């Protein structure tokens, strides 16, 4: 499991040379932007339950065949399991946003999730819709463009973090695609 700091270590260990000078610009910019990163992971973590429930309710209210008798989110057991699957993924995307690298998302969440949903008969494409709804909630919560709740932030620009979490979410959607 590698963060942003360990990624340059593994990149320069293939080189077999000491790392300083050239490779330090990204790390010093990562440090100088760290308050916005903590400020963004806190904003995602504070609104987790509303995000998961809203994403699964949106996925059902766009496709009502899931709660149809014989659908994949039909009974209470399947609905609770979908809410759990929902945000299990939110938890790992929050880990990857905190670490600044998506290696923890690959190793513990997405490694084999593709055919696990196949063996279960889970429709792999309504899950993509739920993932995209969670992504759309995450970017609005980071950039403080949420219509239902406004938070308190110091003024400035952090759309790099919004593009990074959007870059994590489509990866988490394309691993099961």
């Amino acid at each position: 499991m590698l963060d942003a700091f360990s990624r340059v270590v593994v990149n320069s260990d293939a080189k077999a040379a000491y790392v300083g000078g050239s490779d330090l610009q990204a790390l010093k910019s990562f440090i100088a932007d760290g308050n916005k990163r903590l400020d963004a992971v806190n904003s995602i973590v504070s609104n987790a339950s509303c995000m998961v429930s809203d994403a699964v309710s949106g996925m059902i209210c766009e496709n009502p065949g899931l709660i149809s008798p014989g659908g994949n989110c039909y009974t209470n057991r399947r609905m609770a399991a979908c809410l759990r699957d929902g945000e299990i993924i939110l938890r790992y995307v929050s880990y990857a946003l905190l670490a600044g690298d998506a290696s923890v998302l690959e190793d513990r969440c997405l490694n084999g999730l593709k055919e696990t949903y196949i063996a279960l008969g889970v429709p792999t494409n309504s899950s993509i819709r739920a993932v995209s709804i969670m992504k759309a909630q995450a970017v609005a919560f980071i950039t403080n463009t949420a219509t239902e709740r406004k938070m308190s932030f110091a003024a400035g620009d952090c759309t790099s973090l919004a593009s990074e979490v959007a870059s994590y979410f489509d990866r988490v959607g394309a691993a099961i695609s």
Binding site: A4, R7, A26, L27, F30, G100
Partner: peptide, 13 residues
């Protein structure tokens, strides 16, 4: 899929 350190360095320079 995103290298944040290289992106931060490129946005800085």
């Amino acid at each position: 899929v995103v290298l944040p350190v290289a992106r931060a360095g490129l946005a800085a320079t």
